[PDB]
């Protein structure tokens, strides 16, 4: 898949993302590539204003459109938030707002940096013939020196990549149900659990490469959007595309497919019930590349793995299925311990308690799916 833009090695990540744009877009790339220096020094805004409007007709393929969305998205964060100390721009200059929106509408994504921009497309191998480890990778873009954006985006990415090993097993799960091959199904559920158990270890790198004070006080400010944000009460003006201001949520891993596809597969109904948690997760499918959205649809349309397992009186399938739910819980528990360290504690020196409660609701709903 192919039709679902899922790579066998990296899964939902864009494989081998492009680093360079056609020379026709060097004006864009000169800004995006030196944001630390241009923001700190005060030139970034003036430079986005002194930019000519450029067509998107010269972005041939998908890997190039995605790079451009990533260049334009980071530039728009830097323009809107400035040095990241509270001086806000509420108008995105038409000379950049129009191509960012035009390109966005092409990709059916919103004109704002989303998870698939700053994680899934925002990386590269150092030596392409070595393996995908932290030490052999880097990000393409950052916002400020010391904002810990490499460790944050890459460790999220390395977790996505570790989840890839399980994603490629989902076909065999539904096929084993169809063909009623109980042994094949059990082996597939235990292999899915095994890969999600391994993906926990990967999360541990977050402590080595991200510092709480930098993440809370700097990176978090540049990932923020303008949806129910008091600093832009009623959103951001995309000059020359909308006369009205438009609200768009900031980047969030609630735009991720890596856990959502296992929730869906296992019948953990994170999106049911009407609550705030399920509203957010459903609203956030809009900020997900369409092929990945479609993929979660296809999963939701398949016969329930949970129903199959429960209908069969089979302790071993029930344990294999609990092995996957448990592994999701372990990850979300580790994840909540990270949010305590990187947000709750730093803030005591979109609110802290609202975000922990969202994560707790998702965790509790994973917990409740065990047998
Ligand atoms: C410094 C490290 C991290 C912090 C502070 C952090 C914080 C958060 C917060 C506050 C949310 C709530 C949704 C939102 O506010 O957008 C969230 C959601 C989420 N984050 Fe993280 N995160 C971190 C690392 C990671 C990593 C490395 C991954 C691995 C890919 C990850 C995966 C997720 C997922 C899947 C969700 C959606 C809710 C769920 O499925 O449980 N996060 N994160
Ligand atoms: O709302 C949260 C407030 C604090 C800054 C992050 C933001 C969540 N956004 C994320 C991005 Br972008 C990339 C990877 C992620 N992993 N987990 C969350 C997450």
Q: Which H helix or E strand runs over 262?
A: helix 260-266
DSSP one-letter code for 219: I
Place of tokens 């980047």: 251
Atom of ligand 2 nearest to the CA of 223: 12
Q: Which two tokens stand for residue 104?
A: 């966005």
Residue ranges lining ligand 1, Cβ < 6 Å:
152, 155-156, 159-160, 203, 206, 210, 215, 252-254, 256, 259, 332, 335, 338-339, 342-343, 355, 358-359, 362
CB of 226 closer than 8 Å to CB of 80? yes
Distance in angstroms (rounded) separating the CA atoms of residues 225 and 246: 11
Residue 348: how many other CB atoms lie within 10 Å: 7
Count Cβ atoms below 10 Å from residue 335 Cβ, excluding itself. 19
Structure tokens of 345?
């504690």
251 Cβ contact partners less than 8 Å away, ≥ 6 residues apart: 112, 113, 114, 115, 117, 118, 223, 225, 287
Determine which residue's CA is closest to atom 33 belonging to ligand 1: 253
Query: Which ligand 2 atom is nearest residue 343's CA?
Result: 4
Residues in the chain: 371
Tokens standing for 55?
Answer: 């067509």
* Alpha carbons 109 and 94: distance in angstroms, whole number: 19
Q: According to the entry, how was the structure determined?
A: X-ray
> What CA–CA distance (Å, rounded) separates 308 from 150?
42
Residue 335 among known ligand-binding residues: yes
3-state secondary structure of 151: helix
- Give the helix/strand (H/E) hosting 318: helix 315-339
**Which residues, 6+ apart, have CB-to-CB distance to 143 below 8 Å?**
35, 36, 39, 74, 77, 78, 84, 149, 218, 219, 222
């Amino acid at each position: 898949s192919k039709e679902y833009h899922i790579d066998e090695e990296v899964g939902f990540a864009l494989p081998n993302p492009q680093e360079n744009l056609p020379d026709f877009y060097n004006d864009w790339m000169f800004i995006a590539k030196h944001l630390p220096d241009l923001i700190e020094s005060g030139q970034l805004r003036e430079r986005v204003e002194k930019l000519n409007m450029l067509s998107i007709d010269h972005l041939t393929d998908h890997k190039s459109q995605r790079l451009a969305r990533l260049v334009l998205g980071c530039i728009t964060m830097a323009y809107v938030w400035g040095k990241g100390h509270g001086d806000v721009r509420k108008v995105l200059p038409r000379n950049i707002a129009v191509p960012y929106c035009q390109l966005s509408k092409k990709l059916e994504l919103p004109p704002i940096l989303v998870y698939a921009d700053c994680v899934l497309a925002n990386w590269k191998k150092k030596d392409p013939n070595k393996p995908l480890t932290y030490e052999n990778m880097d990000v393409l873009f950052s916002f400020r020196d010391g904002d810990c954006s490499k460790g944050f985006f890459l460790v999220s990415l390395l977790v996505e990549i570790a989840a890839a090993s399980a994603i490629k097993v989902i076909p065999t799960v539904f096929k084993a149900m169809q063909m009623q091959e109980r042994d094949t199904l059990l082996k597939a559920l235990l292999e899915i659990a095994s890969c999600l158990e391994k993906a926990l270890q990967v999360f541990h790198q977050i402590h080595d490469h991200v510092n709480p004070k930098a993440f809370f006080s700097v990176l978090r400010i540049y990932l923020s959007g303008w949806k129910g944000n008091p600093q832009l009460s009623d959103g951001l003006v995309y000059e020359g595309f909308w006369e009205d201001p438009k609200e768009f949520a900031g980047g969030s891993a609630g735009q991720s497919s890596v856990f959502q596809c296992f929730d869906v597969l296992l019948g953990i109904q994170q999106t049911a019930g009407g609550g705030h948690a399920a509203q957010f997760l459903q609203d956030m499918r809009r900020y997900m590349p369409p092929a990945h959205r479609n993929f979660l649809c296809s999963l939701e349309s398949n016969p329930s793995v949970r129903e199959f397992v429960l209908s069969k009186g089979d302790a071993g399938l029930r344990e294999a299925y609990d092995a996957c739910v448990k592994a999701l819980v372990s990850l979300r528990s580790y994840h909540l311990q990270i949010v305590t360290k990187y947000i709750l504690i730093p803030a005591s020196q979109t609110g802290g308690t609202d975000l922990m409660n969202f994560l707790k609701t998702v965790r509790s709903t994973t917990e409740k799916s065990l047998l």
